[PDB]
Amino acid sequence: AVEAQEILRTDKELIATVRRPAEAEAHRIQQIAEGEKVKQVLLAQAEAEKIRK
Amino acid sequence: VVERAQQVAVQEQEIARREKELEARVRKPAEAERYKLERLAEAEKSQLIMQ
Amino acid sequence: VVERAQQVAVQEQEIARREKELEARVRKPAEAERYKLERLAEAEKSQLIMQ
Question: Which cellular compartments is it found in (chain A)?
């Protein structure tokens, strides 16, 4: 029974330790990727119209 | 057995604590950085087009 | 003879103790690592596609 309670505790600990940080990291990566994509698109548009003019 | 059967409740509260703390320290800074990058890129485009 | 005939019961409890402990220290960490790899790979794909 000691080890069964330890199983439950380590399940919850692994959740709080790696499962949620993984989701937070995924959200951070996708947010930063969105920012970088918008920045690159705007810079490319600026360069293209520079070349056109 | 009692010790471990209550440490499981400690971790049950810890999971939500990590939820909140990780959100505050990761998701909101990421949103703020994305907005900062958006605005600075818009300013750079506005400057480059008219230069 | 009595000593050994009770050490066999000691090991009879030890087999289930090893069951539980090995599950906790191997199977659950493996599941957590698989989920972490899944989510990080999904994030990397989401970033690479739009870059």
Answer: Cell membrane; Membrane, Caveola; Endosome; Membrane
Tell me whether residues B14 and A49 touch, CB distance under 8 A.
no
B26 touches chain A (CB under 8 A): yes
Give the chains touching B; criterion: ≥3 Cβ pairs < 8 Å: A
Query: In the PDB record, what is the listed experimental method?
Result: cryo-EM
Q: At what angle do helices A20-52 and C28-50 cross, to 10 degrees?
A: 10
**Distances in Å between the alpha carbon of A39 and those of A43, B29, B39, C39, C50?**
6, 18, 9, 25, 12
User: Per-residue b/e over C3-37, b at no fewer than 16 CB within 10 Å?
Assistant: eeeeeeeeeeeeeeeeebbebbeeebeeebeebbe
